[PDB]
Structure formats: C-alpha cells, structure tokens
RNA sequence: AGCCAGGAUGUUGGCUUAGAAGCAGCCAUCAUUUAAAGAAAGCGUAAUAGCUCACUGGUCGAGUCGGCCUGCGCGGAAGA
C-alpha cells in the first residue's frame, strides 16, 4: 500500500485538480493503462488494481506503477462540530488528470496485457484506456 | 470395421489371465465370461510368452460367448522391460529422468505385424519414438 | 514513398489551430536547412493512418505543398493526451 | 432467470435478443444463462 | 451462414493412477495415416463411452467479419 515513508508536513490544502496529465507515454514497458478521466486514485485502489493485474499474468512479465499517492486526506468523524482544527489524515490519494499513464507492463503477449489491464480498471474510479508504446 | 458392436480393453498382463483384483466383475457381463478369458485368451497367450500387456476385441451379437482375434501390445509397455524404468514419470520434466537411443525399440516395434501407420517403416518407426517421451526421457537418436 | 499533401497555413495561434483540429485537419511545421520554416496544415486521417507504420518515423517522407515537394523526416510529434489522435508534427528539412 | 444491469453471453450457445425494449439472453444449452434487463 | 461427410494414428497416452481410456489428477505438448482432425472442444459413463465441436472435403453462389473517429437514442431507474 503506497504512501510517503516520510513528509515535510502532515497535512495538505484541498487544492484543485485542473489541467492535463504529465506522464503521458508508455515509457518503461510495452503496454500501459491510461487515465481518460479526472479523479483521485487511492492507495487501496492503486493496490486493488495492481493485485488484479498481477494475478492475471501469474508470475510473469514486469509491472511499473507510474502513479504514487503522496496526497494526505483528512476527515472529521461522526459527532463533531465544524471547526476546532483540521481533521486527522485517514488516507492518501494520487491526483489524476486526463492523460496519465497509470500502470505499464511488459514481458507478456498483448492480449494478456489487455486482459490484465481490463481487470484492474474495474477496480478504478476513473475511465481508462489501453495504450501501446510508440516510436517518438 | 463396420460400426458399433461390443469391444473393450481393461487388463494387466498376458501372464495374469482372467484376473479378479485388477478387474474382476468388469471382464464379462454382456456376452463375455469371467471364466472364458482363457479358452480364446490362451488360444495363443502361453505359446509365445507371459510378460506383455495387451487388450483385445469382443465382437458379440447374441452368440453365447464372443469372437475376438487378438493382436499387439502397446509401446509404453516395452519401456519397462527393454528400455528403462518400470515406473516411468518420476518427475517427468524436472530433470531428464531416464534415457533411450535410436537402436532401442526400433526392432521392439518394427515387429508389429498387426498394426502401425505409413508404408515407410522409417516413419512408423519414429511413431513409437514418442511413446518414449510422454514420460520425458532423452534423445540419443 | 510516404507522400503527405499539405496547404501552408494562412493563420497561426491557439485559436486558429483549435479551429483546425475541429475540422479534422491538424497543424505541423517544417524547419531545418537555410529556408524559413513553413507552417503547414495536414489532413488528420491520412497522416494518422500513415504513422501507424513504423517506417514513417525512420524513412524520409515527402511533403507536397503547392505542387512543390519538400523531403523531410519526422522530428517530434505531439499526440492527443488520451485519444488516438495527432495534435502537431515537427518535420526536419532533410 | 437472472436479472441485472450487465448481461452477457456466458457461452457459445448464449444468444442476445431484444424483446420489447429489453435486452435478454437466451441460451439453448443452459437455463442458468437466461438473463434479463441490462 | 446453413446443410451432407469426415473428425483419425503412436494412443486405452507414460503418469505421487484403488479405476481415467482426453477429463479435478500427472507432467510435459511430442509424433505417425491424411482433405484435415486437438496426449485436446463437452454435456458427460463402473470403465468401455454413445453423441455435437476446433480443423478439412463437398454443396451452395456473392458478399462477409469486427476494431477505430463520431451524432442521436436504450437498459441500469424503488416512496409514501
Ligand atoms: Mg481563447
Ligand atoms: Mg410480453
Ligand atoms: Mg461455409
Ligand atoms: Mg442512459
Ligand atoms: Zn449459455
């Protein structure tokens, strides 16, 4: 379950998630699973999908995860007034813009990379598409 | 050769005729006898040898017993006594296990005067080469 | 062997280039050599289908603008962030 | 029959058919495959 | 697309098999006769299996298959 091993500050402003994505090409493996929509992937989510894809290819090929949480989310629990300080960090998410390569894979036949990427997408809160490596 | 009419195959070896433990009740129930696996069974079993597994026809209609001309033994049956282990697999594809060569089983299957496919006898030669490889041996061919 | 047809662009800038892609055309550019660069408009489907083939990025291709022929090589391409599309190509006069 | 948002051929014998305004799965080999509404 | 045929031979495949003979098992996945036919498609026998398939002849006689960019719709949709 990904999350920073350490950080300069405990909590982050909410911020906005405008813009288009930055790591947009399959740049390590032969196949990628790409964000088509905008959202937040959570550690649990990033991990659930990973598990899905990893088991699909049994112990074969290789997998990169192009995204990493690093955004701490707080929540206030039941029975609590507004105010009285920012709440407690409960989990981490990765801000996602359209275009992000999320996972890449390699060392397996295309169809299998497709099967595996499919299965993983089903665990994700944002639409995705299969991409392939390109020259240039 | 015509269609369907009585035929099976479930035995142990030519040197154990008619037995009960390996088989028993399932060797005569449809125009076939648990007692008559010797009069036509041994119509040429003893003559030659008792040490090679062989199943055979049944050809029945409704005629008391049955008329079944016999024929040949398999080819993994001739890897226990003539080309290696009495087991076979071991760990079939873990390491090479056991091994054979091209001189071996060439004649122990070039015998077949009642089976095999392809006029060329250099071919149905190599047809019995694999029956020493479904166990995972080595090729000294 | 790869032959790409192309008008020169009467306009430039975000506005003009977005208008471009809205009409299933897309902008590109040619530079290198001693001549000024040439701002180009390409048909989408045509070029798109072409660059599906690996040799497109290795071979010299020939760009026909106004009956004149320029020989180039693919230099860089901007692709759509998640659509199978082309936003812009850089061609080198070679 | 099984009724649910995603319906899908489960085998080579499964067929898909629209009856009235509704997507339905007829299978000729396996009653458990018969689906409705998706 | 449909309909008529075939779907074989090492091999009932060796196998931590009581019995498997393609079958949860076993491991690899070879090799003969052919138009082609899988140590493998299947509902599935006490084990034989009986019966349709992957593949290939014939018949037929002109189109057929499914991904891509996209417009508009369909299901998903239960309340006093
Ligand atoms: Mg503007
Ligand atoms: Mg009705
Ligand atoms: Mg046809
Ligand atoms: Mg709708
Ligand atoms: Zn079905």
UniProtKB/Swiss-Prot annotation, chain A:
Record PTM: Is hydroxylated on Arg-81 by RoxA. The modification is nearly suppressed when E.coli is grown in anoxia.
Keyword set, alphabetical order:
Hydroxylation, Methylation, Ribonucleoprotein, Ribosomal protein, RNA-binding, rRNA-binding, tRNA-binding
One of its Pfam families is Ribosomal_L16
Give residue numbers for the modification ((3R)-3-hydroxyarginine).
81
- Look up the record and give one Gene Ontology term from the biological process aspect: cytoplasmic translation
- Keyword Cell inner membrane listed: no
Annotated positions of the N-methylmethionine modification: 1
A GO cellular component annotation here is: cytosolic large ribosomal subunit
Q: Example GO molecular function term?
A: tRNA binding
The entry's family comment says: Belongs to the universal ribosomal protein uL16 family.
Q: What does this protein do?
A: Binds directly to 23S ribosomal RNA and is located at the A site of the peptidyltransferase center. It contacts the A and P site tRNAs. One of the last ribosomal proteins to be assembled in the 50S subunit. The simultaneous presence of uL16 and bL36 probably triggers ObgE's GTPase activity and eventual dissociation from the mature 50S ribosmal subunit. It has an essential role in subunit assembly.
| Subunit structure of this chain's protein | Part of the 50S ribosomal subunit. Cross-links to the A and P site tRNAs. Interacts with assembly factor DarP(YjgA).
The name on file for this protein is: Large ribosomal subunit protein uL16
Task: Give the source species.
Answer: Escherichia coli (strain K12)
Gene name of the encoded protein? rplP
UniProtKB/Swiss-Prot annotation, chain B:
User: SMART domains in the record, alphabetically?
Assistant: RL11 (SM00649)
N,N,N-trimethylalanine: which positions carry it?
1
Q: Which residues carry this modification: N6,N6,N6-trimethyllysine?
A: 3, 39
Keyword annotations from UniProtKB, A to Z: Methylation, Ribonucleoprotein, Ribosomal protein, RNA-binding, rRNA-binding
Q: Which GO terms describe its biological process?
A: cytoplasmic translation; ribosomal large subunit assembly; stringent response; translation; translational termination
What positions are modified (N6-succinyllysine)? 71, 80
Give the UniProt entry's GO cellular component terms.
cytoplasm; cytosol; cytosolic large ribosomal subunit
Instruction: Report the InterPro entries cross-referenced here.
Output: Ribosomal_uL11 (IPR000911), Ribosomal_uL11_bac-typ (IPR006519), Ribosomal_uL11_C (IPR020783), Ribosomal_uL11_C_sf (IPR036769), Ribosomal_uL11_CS (IPR020785), Ribosomal_uL11_N (IPR020784), Ribosomal_uL11_N_sf (IPR036796)
Keyword DNA damage among UniProt keywords: no
* GO terms for MF: large ribosomal subunit rRNA binding; rRNA binding; structural constituent of ribosome
Keyword Ribosomal protein present in the record's keywords: the answer is: yes
Q: What does this protein do?
A: Forms part of the ribosomal stalk which helps the ribosome interact with GTP-bound translation factors.
**HAMAP family given for it?**
Ribosomal_uL11
Q: Which PANTHER family match?
A: 60S RIBOSOMAL PROTEIN L12 (PTHR11661), LARGE RIBOSOMAL SUBUNIT PROTEIN UL11M (PTHR11661:SF1)
- Oligomer and partners: Part of the ribosomal stalk of the 50S ribosomal subunit. Interacts with L10 and the large rRNA to form the base of the stalk. L10 forms an elongated spine to which 2 L12 dimers bind in a sequential fashion forming a pentameric L10(L12)2(L12)2 complex.
- Indicate the family of this protein: Belongs to the universal ribosomal protein uL11 family.
Q: What NCBIfam families does the database record attribute to this sequence?
A: L11_bact
Name of the protein = Large ribosomal subunit protein uL11
Taxonomic lineage of this organism?
Bacteria, Pseudomonadati, Pseudomonadota, Gammaproteobacteria, Enterobacterales
Instruction: State the encoding gene.
Output: rplK
From Swiss-Prot, chain C:
List keywords of the entry alphabetically. Ribonucleoprotein, Ribosomal protein, RNA-binding, rRNA-binding
Q: Where are the transmembrane segments?
A: none
Q: Entry's Pfam families?
A: Ribosomal_L25p
Recorded GO cellular component terms are: cytoplasm; cytosol; cytosolic large ribosomal subunit
- CDD domains from the UniProt entry: Ribosomal_L25_TL5_CTC
GO MF, any single term: structural constituent of ribosome
| Assembly information from the UniProt record | Part of the 50S ribosomal subunit; part of the 5S rRNA/L5/L18/L25 subcomplex. Contacts the 5S rRNA.
Family, according to the entry, reads as follows: Belongs to the bacterial ribosomal protein bL25 family.
- Name of the protein in its database record: Large ribosomal subunit protein bL25
Organism of derivation: Escherichia coli (strain K12)
Curated annotation (Swiss-Prot), chain D:
Q: Name one GO molecular function term.
A: rRNA binding
* Alphabetical list of PROSITE patterns matching this protein: RIBOSOMAL_L36
Question: What family does this chain come from, according to its entry?
Answer: Belongs to the bacterial ribosomal protein bL36 family.
Q: What is this protein called?
A: Large ribosomal subunit protein bL36A
Q: Which UniProt keywords apply?
A: Ribonucleoprotein, Ribosomal protein, RNA-binding, rRNA-binding
Keyword rRNA-binding in record: yes
Cellular component terms per the entry's GO annotation: cytoplasm; cytosolic large ribosomal subunit
* Biological function: One of the last ribosomal proteins to be assembled in the 50S subunit, it contacts a number of helices in the 23S rRNA, acting as molecular glue. The simultaneous presence of uL16 and bL36 probably triggers ObgE's GTPase activity and eventual dissociation from the mature 50S ribosomal subunit.
Q: Which SUPFAM superfamilies match?
A: Ribosomal protein L36
Is this entry keyworded Transmembrane? no
Query: Which GO BP terms sit in this record?
Result: cytoplasmic translation; translation
Where are its TM segments located?
Answer: none
* Superkingdom classification of source: Bacteria
Outline the subunit composition. Answer: Part of the 50S ribosomal subunit.
Lineage summary: Bacteria, Pseudomonadati, Pseudomonadota, Gammaproteobacteria, Enterobacterales
């Amino acid at each position: 379950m990904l999350q920073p091993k350490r950080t300069k500050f405990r909590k982050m402003h909410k911020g906005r998630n405008r813009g288009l994505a930055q790591g947009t090409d399959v740049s390590f493996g032969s196949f990628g699973l790409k964000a088509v929509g905008r959202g937040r992937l959570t550690a649990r989510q990033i991990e659930a999908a990973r598990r899905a894809m990893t088991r699909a290819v049994k112990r074969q090929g290789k997998i990169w995860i192009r995204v990493f949480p690093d955004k701490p989310i707080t929540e206030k629990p039941l029975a609590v007034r507004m105010g009285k300080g920012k709440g407690n960090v409960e989990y981490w998410v990765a801000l996602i813009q359209p275009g992000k390569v999320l996972y890449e894979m390699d060392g397996v036949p295309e169809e299998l990379a497709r099967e595996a990427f499919k299965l993983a997408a089903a665990k994700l809160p944002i639409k995705t598409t299969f991409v392939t490596k390109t020259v240039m | 050769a015509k269609k369907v009419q009585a035929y099976v195959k479930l035995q142990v070896a030519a040197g154990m005729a008619n037995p009960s433990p390996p088989v028993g009740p399932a060797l005569g129930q449809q125009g076939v006898n648990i007692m008559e696996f010797c009069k036509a069974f041994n119509a040429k079993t003893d003559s030659i040898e008792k040490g090679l597994p062989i199943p055979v026809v049944i050809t029945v209609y409704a005629d008391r017993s049955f008329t079944f001309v016999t024929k040949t033994p398999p080819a993994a049956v001739l890897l226990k006594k003539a080309a290696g282990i009495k087991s076979g697999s071991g760990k079939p594809n873990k390491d090479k296990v056991g091994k054979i060569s091209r001189a071996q089983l060439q004649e122990i299957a070039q015998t077949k005067a009642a089976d095999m496919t392809g006029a060329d006898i250099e071919a149905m030669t190599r047809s019995i080469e694999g029956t020493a490889r479904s166990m995972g041996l080595v090729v000294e061919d | 062997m790869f032959t790409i047809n192309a008008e020169v662009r009467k306009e430039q800038g975000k506005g003009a280039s977005r208008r471009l892609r809205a009409a299933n055309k897309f902008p590109a550019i040619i530079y290198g050599g001693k001549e000024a660069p040439l701002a180009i408009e390409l048909d989408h489907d045509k070029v798109m289908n072409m660059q599906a083939k690996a040799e497109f990025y290795s071979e010299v291709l020939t760009i026909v603008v106004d009956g004149k022929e320029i020989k180039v090589k693919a230099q860089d391409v901007q692709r759509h962030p998640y659509k199978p599309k082309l936003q812009h190509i850089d061609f080198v006069r070679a | 029959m099984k009724v649910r948002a995603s319906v899908k051929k489960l085998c080579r014998n499964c067929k898909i058919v629209k009856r009235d305004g509704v997507i339905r799965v007829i299978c000729s080999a396996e009653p458990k495959h018969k689906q409705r509404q998706g």
